[PDB]
Each structure stands twice: as C-alpha cells, then as structure tokens.
Amino acid sequence: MTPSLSAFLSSVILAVVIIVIPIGAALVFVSTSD
Amino acid sequence: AKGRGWLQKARIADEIDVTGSQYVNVPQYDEIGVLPPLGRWDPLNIKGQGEARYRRFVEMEIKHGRMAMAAVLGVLTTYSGIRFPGYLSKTLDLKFEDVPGTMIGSWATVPVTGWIQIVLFVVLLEASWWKQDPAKAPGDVVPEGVWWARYPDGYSIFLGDGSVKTVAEDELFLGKTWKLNAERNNGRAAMMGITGMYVHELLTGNPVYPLG
Amino acid sequence: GVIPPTGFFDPLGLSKNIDEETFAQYRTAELKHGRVAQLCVIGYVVPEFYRFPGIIAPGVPFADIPNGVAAINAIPALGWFQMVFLIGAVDYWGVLGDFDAGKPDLAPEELEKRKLQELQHGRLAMLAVLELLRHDSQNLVKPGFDGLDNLITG
Amino acid sequence: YENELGVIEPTGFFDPLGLSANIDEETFAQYRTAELKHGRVAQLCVIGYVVPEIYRFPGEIAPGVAFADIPNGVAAINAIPSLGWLQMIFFIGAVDYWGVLGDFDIGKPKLDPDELEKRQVQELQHGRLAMIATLELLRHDSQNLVTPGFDGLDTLITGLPFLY
Amino acid sequence: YENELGVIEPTGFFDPLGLSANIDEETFAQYRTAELKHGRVAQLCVIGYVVPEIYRFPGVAFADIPNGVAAINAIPSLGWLQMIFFIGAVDYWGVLGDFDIGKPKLDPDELEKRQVQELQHGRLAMIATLELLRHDSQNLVTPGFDGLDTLITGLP
Amino acid sequence: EETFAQYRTAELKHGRVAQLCVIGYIVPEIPNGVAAINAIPALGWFQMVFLIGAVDYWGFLGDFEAGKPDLAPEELEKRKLQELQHGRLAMLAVLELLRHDSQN
Amino acid sequence: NAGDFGGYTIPIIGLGLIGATIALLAGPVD
Amino acid sequence: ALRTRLGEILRPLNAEYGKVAPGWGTTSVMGVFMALFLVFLVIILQIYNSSIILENVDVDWVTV
Ligand code: CLA
Ligand code: CLA
Ligand code: CLA
Ligand code: KC1
Fold first, then answer.
1. Cα(E54)–Cα(E57) distance, rounded to whole angstroms?
2. Pairwise CA distance, residues D21 & D17, whole Å
C-alpha cells in the first residue's frame, strides 16, 4: 500500500462518512419529521 | 426447528404487469432434443416403430452422446499436451508424459490391464450402479444420494442481496429443459466430432487436422 | 441331462440309493465342474499367442510364465490366495455373478433346451480338460513321453 | 432429524453413515453442541494460522522465550514452554465449562427469529467449512515439519502468497 | 439386537456405525457366524505364530520355512493349494476329520457363559492378529522397524 | 442447594486428585517434580490432559461398576466422612510439597 | 501465413453453414 | 402479420413485453454495482493521471 493508494482509500472512506452518510441521515430525519 | 424459514422471506415476489395487474403468460418443441432449427427431425420415423423402440433410441442417443462428449474432451486435453502428474504404470515404467496424446497413440500405449479397469468400471456402472429405471426419465441413471447436480422445477438461485429466485423448467440457461436440451445437442455435436477426429487422425495423424 | 445318443447313463449305481433331495447338489456340482472346465479349455489356448502386458508379482512378469501347470508354482502363493478368495466370493456370495442382465428372459421351450447343451458342452469339456492337464503333467515331469511336445495339438 | 438446523441447499440432510437415525434427542443436542464448538474453534484456528504471519504480540510470552522466535504452526507447540500451555488450557476451559468472561449479554443480540436462525445456519456452515480447512492446514504444516518441502509448497499459508 | 450374546458391560452393544441396525435375522446370524469364524482363526493364528518356534514338523524341508509372512513364498503355491481346499472341506460341508465327529457338552447355565467367552477371547485375538501381522510384514521389507524379534515375549 | 452440590463435588475431587499426587511423587525416585513439567513436551500434555478430561467429564474409563461395591447404607456413611478427612489431609500435604520448591 | 488456423477450412465451412441455415429457414411455415 | 420459420423460432424471446418485478426489485443490488463501478473508474483514471502511484507499475511506454 503506497502512500498515494492509502490516500485514495482514505479519501473514499472520508467521502462516504463525512458527505454521503451525514447528508443521507439528515435527509431521512427531516423527511420523516416533516 | 426447520432451518428453511428465511427462504420464503428472501424469495422475490412474482413478476407482474407494469400497469399493476397480474401478468398473462400467453410451442411445438415439447420433447427434449426437439429444438427450434429442425424441430422433430425423424427421417427414418423411429417414433413410428413403437413406444418401446422409441424409448430405446432416446436412452441410446443420450448414452452415445454422453461418452462422445467425454471422448472429445479427452482427446482435446491430451493432444494439447495436458497430462496428469506422475506414473501411469510404475511396473511398466510408463509415465503420463510418455504416452502420446493422440487417439491411436493413447489407445495402444495404455496397457491392456489398465484398459480392463476402465472397461470394468463402465461394466460395473452399466450393470449394477447406474442402471436405467423404466419409471425414471431416459438418461436418469444416477440414483438418489450420489450427489448429482439436479435442477428441479422451482429450484432456488441466489442474488447479490441474498434474495432467492425460483427457476422454472422453461427458464433460459437455468431451467431443466435448457440443460437437458444442451446435453442432447452437445452430445449430438460431439458424436459427429469424435468420429471426425478419429478419421482425420486415421488419414493424417492429426485429430483436429486443419488446426495445429 | 438325458440326451438322445444314450439313455439314463448311470453305470455304477449312483442314482438309486442316493435320494432326490441332495440330487440337486450333484447337479450344481456337475454344472460348475463343466463351467470351470469350459473356461479352462480356452484358458489353455489363449495364453499361447497373447499375454498380459505387466507383471503379476514383484519380479514375476507375465511373459516368462509357462502356460502349463508350471504356472501354478510360478505365481506366488499369496497371489494365489487373492485370486482364490475373489473367485470364492463369486462362488459363494455371488458378488460379481448375480447381475440380472446375465439372466435373459427366454420362453420355456428354448429355456430348458438351453440348459441341455450347457452342461453337455461342459461335459465334453471335463474330459477335454482331463486330457489337457494329463499331457501337461506327463511332460512337465519328464520331457518327451509322447511323440508330440506341444501344449495345444492345433 | 431431517427437520433441524444445518439442512442446506447443496446436500440437504447429510447422513451417509446413518449416525443420527437411531440416536435420541440428548445425543443430537450433544452432537450439535459438539459441531458448533468444533466449528467455532476451527474458525479461530484458520484465523490463528494467518495472523501471526502479519502481526506478532510485542513482549515476551515467557521470561526466556520471546513472541517472535516461536515458529508459526504446529512447531509453536514445542517452542512454547510446557507449563505455559497447561495454564492456557485451563483458562479457556473455565470459559468452556462455566462461562467466565465469556457469557456477556453484549454479544447476544435481539434479532428476528427467522434472522437469528438464518445466522445460526450461517454459523454452522462457516464452522463446517473451517473444519475442512483446518485439516488441510494441519496436514500441510505437520508434514512439512517432518520433511521440509514434502509436497513442494515451502510456505505455511500456501494459498495467500501476498503474506510472503 | 441388544438381547443377544456378546453384549458385555465394558461398552455394551457397541455398534457405533450402526451396521446391525435394520437388518434381518438371517444377516445377523450371518454376521455372527462371520464374527465367530474370524475369531476362531485369529485365536489359532496367534498360537500358530508361537508353536513353530519350539516344534518343527518332520519336496521342501519342514524346518527351513520361516515362521513370519515369508512362509507363503517358501512353500510351493501348488503345495498351499490342496491345503486351502482341505480347510474348505471342513468349512462348507462340515465333514471334520480334524475333530472326527465331536459331541459338544451343553450345560444349561454354562452354555451362554462359554459361548460369550469364545467370542470375547476371539475378539481380542482378532485385535492381536493385527499387531502380529503388522510387525511381521513391515519387518520383512525393512528389518529393524523398532524391533527385531518376531514375538515380543522373550521366552523364546 | 444447587450451589452446594457443585461445592461438594469440587471439594471431593480436589481431595481425590491430591491423593494420587502424593503417591505419584513417591514412586518416581523410589526428571522429577514440577521442574520436570517443562521437560516433557506439551504435545504429550495435550494427549494426557484430554484423556484425563474424557474420564473426568464423560467417564470413559472411570464409571465401571467393578469399583462400585454395594456394601451397606450404614457402612457407606462411615467411610463417606472418611473420604473428606483423607481428602483434606492429602490436599494440605500437596501445598507443603509445592511449598518445598524454592519460592518466596 | 496461409494455412494458419485451419487455412481456408473454417471460413468455407462457416460460410456454407450460414448459407445452408438461411436456405433451411427460407420456406414458409405450414 | 407474416409468420416465418425464424419468426416462430424467435417468438418466445419477444413475448414478455411489459413484464416487471413489483416494487423496487433488485435496485439495491444495482446501486451497489454502480457504486463499485464508479470507484473502479476513478481508480483507473487516477492511475492514468498518476494520482495513484502503485507499487511497481509505471505509466509509461513499455517494451515487449
Ligand atoms: C466433529 C464435528 C462434527 C459433529 C459432531 C457433527 C454432527 C452433526 N452434523 Mg455435520 N459437519 C462437520 C462436522 C460435524 N458434524 C464437517 C467437518 C462437515 C463438512 C463435511 C459437516 C457437514 C454437515 C452437513 C451438511 C449436515 C451435518 C449435520 C450434522 C448432524 C447430524 C448428522 C450426524 O449424524 O452427525 C454425527 C457425527 C458425529 C457425531 C461425528 C462423526 C465423526 C466421523 C466418524 C469422523 C470421520 C472422519 C473424518 C473424515 C476426518 C478424518 C480425517 C483423518 C485424516 C484423521 C449432527 C449435529 C446435518 C445437520 O446439521 O442436522 C440436521 C447436516 O445437514 N454436518
Ligand atoms: C481443562 C480444559 C477444558 C474444559 C474443562 C473443557 C470443557 C468441555 N469442553 Mg473444551 N476445549 C479445551 C479444553 C477444555 N474444555 C481446549 C484446549 C479446546 C480447543 C481450543 C477445547 C474445545 C472443545 C471442543 C471442540 C469440544 C469441547 C467439549 C467440552 C466438554 C467435554 C470435554 C471432554 O472431556 O472431551 C474429551 C474428548 C476427547 C478425549 C476426544 C478428543 C481427543 C483429541 C483429538 C485429543 C487431541 C490431543 C492433541 C491435540 C494431540 C493430537 C494428535 C494425537 C491425537 C495423535 C466439556 C464441557 C466438547 C463438547 O462440549 O461437546 C461434546 C466438544 O465438542 N471443547
Ligand atoms: C470380522 C469380524 C467381525 C464381525 C463380522 C462382527 C459382527 C458382529 N459383531 Mg462384533 N467385534 C469384532 C469383529 C466382528 N464382529 C472385533 C475385532 C471386536 C473388538 C473391537 C468386536 C467387538 C464387538 C462388540 C463389543 C459387539 C459386537 C457385536 C457384533 C454384532 C453386531 C454389530 C455389527 O453390526 O457388526 C458388523 C461388523 C462388520 C460388518 C465387520 C466390521 C468390519 C468393518 C466394516 C471395517 C472395520 C475395519 C477395522 C477397523 C480393522 C481395520 C484394519 C486396518 C487398519 C488394517 C455382529 C454379529 C455386538 C454383539 O456381539 O451382538 C449384538 C456387540 O455388542 N462386536
Ligand atoms: C475360498 C474360495 C472358495 C469358496 C468359499 C468356494 C466355495 C464353493 N465352491 Mg468353489 N472353487 C474355488 C474356490 C472357492 N470355492 C476355486 C478357486 C475354483 C476353481 C479351481 C473352484 C471351483 C469349484 C468347482 C468345480 C465346484 C466348486 C463348488 C463350491 C461350493 C461347494 C463347496 C465344495 O464342494 O467344496 C462352495 C460354494 C462345488 C459345488 O458347487 O458343488 C456342490 C463344485 O462342484 N468350486
């Protein structure tokens, strides 16, 4: 695992756990609330 | 506790019409071996020689096609140079690599005591173990509990999510009738294939003579 | 077993005092003796021109075996034990001699007709074998008792 | 016992030797408990054959023997001091019999009865596969210890060349 | 078949595989005649390994044949042949010669005790015959397989 | 009640195995002792402990009726107390025997 | 280069097979 | 309409018009394969872009 490959894997994980999952959870919460 | 309760919940629902209503299912190829291009190709009218005489010919085509499919694969493997590791006969100093991959070459070089063991295994299979039951379907000679790949109507296949689809007999590439037809047709093609490889070898020494 | 050439052939009184319940035992004894003799006739002819390719025992090839009664002592005794016991499994248990395909459904009229020359072919095979191992025993001990010195006279 | 847990699609009920036709319930409950525990140990054995090739424990297992000099596989049995092995058996035996530090309710989840039962067959199937894999690992490792390079494969974990 | 001879306290109707399960009475008598006869030869094989050491019988010499599994090579195979059928004369037909006719005693309370002791001594001898045959046959092809004497007991 | 049943069985087994321990410490000299526990390979202990556990848990070679005399109900009660007395004594001899090995 | 992979055999057999199937399916039904 | 020999042969292949799986079907499996395809396409793009430098593969002209 080269540093660039590890950086790519970290970027994918970070995108999923900071952008995708929080926005989806917020959407689910505000859609079930309203 | 029966361990098969999760199967029904994982089963995919029945396919419907796009509008929402139930789907309407809405021909001459009923027998295995009767295929779209030729239909029932019976120039000699063997079907008219009697039901007992026609039942004989179905099992006869199935058996002849099954050995020919194995025979074709055997020559294509050995003539390509693929061999088992080790010795075929340590008494006769016969390594696998020494035996020719050609049909006539492998038929002569394999010892007759070795050939007897192949024949006796076929005799044991033909006379006691894999015997055709008159009540059973033609070619269904493997008994129950001998671990054979069976494709009964409505058997389960599994998708990526774990969902379960039941496969009818008329399904493309997965139904029983498709696999039964493909066994008969590949058997028919290998039947002509193995005798063609024999005569091309008799004439040129090459079983696949144009190729190579 | 009564054939048109002769009658109820029994010269030494072996069918009057002997009862008819154990008489079947002599019939299987006669049928199996003739069957053994029948394979012994062709088992004496075939190994002249053809032999098995390998060895039978370590150091004992199939090729350098005399076809005669010397083949018994040529093959080791432990090799004979495996052959005799495998034969006896078929002889007693019917391990490899009970398949239904060897029992053809023949109508009665040809059925007991097919038993008549079965034991009769075996009958001459007993005496034909009895001459065969006689010439083989009368030549293995000393060579040249008779004018001919071949195992098969033909 | 054709209608119990463990019946799965490729084989159905698998009893070619008939070791369950003439048995009672208490024998089958012991058999399933044996099968589940044989599978659980074999699952950890496959894991325990691969992890020391990657990571070892910092420190010393014994005052004389460190964690890295121990060869992986069955050779670790003799290299580890014997008195250390005896206390290891009795630790995992206390959890085996009583359930000391091995019976928490954190593990056991509240699943659907069909979902929990499906996972139970999944637990058995993974354990049944791992027992078959444990035989191959032990056969390759022990024979290589007796004769180095017996089969030709000179690595402990033959199927994972990226470890080496 | 739990109410038969041979069901003894150490295990008690052993049958782990279940070979006696769901078989008719003829096959069990067949198994019992096999178990008895296997034990009888095994009881005679173990002592048949010891008595040629001290006693020797008087166109081969009856004192040069080794007592191991090398015996079958020294005796001619034809010589071995009429002996095999001689055992078969007393096996199938039952005409004895060796025991002449033989009238066995039948004590009512001793019959089932002596019959069981015939099987159990025979069962042990069958296990013992495997050890005797293992040591003898392995040492012929490799002399010195952790032991040299044919019989482990040292009174020879 | 249920707890006392396991306490009675454990106190009984501890005394019993101590009885074999002291005599098993006498026959070897007349590798020995706890220092010898490391010399013998642990593959041997794997076979020995599980063989011990077979008769410990199931009773493979330790549930035979030949070692179970009927005796008398009053005869049994006297030696039942004697099992504990020889049990507690043979236990205390083991710790002192273990104490004799060089240790703080 | 000619004679490799069967020579002209497979193109001749292949073209003859396509032409024969078209002629077999050319007739009307029933 | 005209009935032909080949048309009768190919008739079952065009006989399931409008047939659907009810509800969402296998859309969840499809989304996983789409997501894996998106990650795979980014990988081979970044390898070509030299934004992912692998162990011993070099994005440059090779010999033989
Ligand atoms: C020792 C572990 C063990 C035990 C106790 C069991 C026990 C059980 N299994 Mg099972 N299993 C195992 C491991 C085990 N299995 C392995 C490794 C596989 C993969 C082949 C399976 C595959 C399997 C399936 C697919 C099914 C079962 C089922 C069952 C149940 C009923 C069948 C029976 O009568 O078993 C009794 C068997 C024993 C008590 C142990 C017998 C031990 C044999 C004699 C050893 C044979 C030697 C072996 C080949 C290793 C030799 C190696 C050599 C080189 C030393 C029962 C709970 C069925 C089910 O779960 O119930 C409905 C079922 O459908 N098993
Ligand atoms: C003191 C330690 C201890 C205690 C109190 C227990 C508690 C229990 N366990 Mg565990 N167990 C232990 C150690 C222990 N276990 C260890 C170290 C392991 C492996 C990590 C296990 C894994 C295990 C399994 C897989 C099973 C148990 C079972 C049992 C029960 C019966 C055990 C028994 O006596 O069978 C005695 C058994 C035998 C004597 C037969 C096994 C013999 C093996 C093959 C010996 C291996 C020796 C060694 C590896 C050398 C191999 C080569 C050699 C054979 C040539 C009992 C409740 C069984 C159960 O609960 O249901 C039946 C069960 O199936 N345990
Ligand atoms: C040829 C030997 C033979 C035969 C035919 C029998 C037959 C019988 N025995 Mg018996 N037995 C034998 C030898 C035999 N035994 C030996 C050596 C022992 C000592 C372990 C026993 C201990 C024994 C007990 C304790 C009991 C029986 C019982 C029975 C009866 C029912 C059980 C059964 O189904 O057996 C069927 C047996 C066979 C079909 C033959 C077994 C051979 C198997 C298939 C292979 C085993 C190979 C073996 C491990 C050797 C390998 C050697 C290799 C390493 C070189 C039946 C009459 C029961 C009883 O007496 O009456 C109810 C009973 O309680 N046996
Ligand atoms: C150990 C292996 C073995 C057993 C267990 C066994 C059993 C029986 N044999 Mg067989 N036998 C051989 C071996 C064995 N036989 C061999 C190697 C040969 C070829 C040389 C051979 C040939 C003959 C002939 C010609 C006859 C014969 C018979 C019987 C029958 C009666 C027993 C007897 O009479 O001794 C029983 C079932 C006769 C018969 O059925 O008459 C009633 C009969 O006539 N056998």
1. 10
2. 9
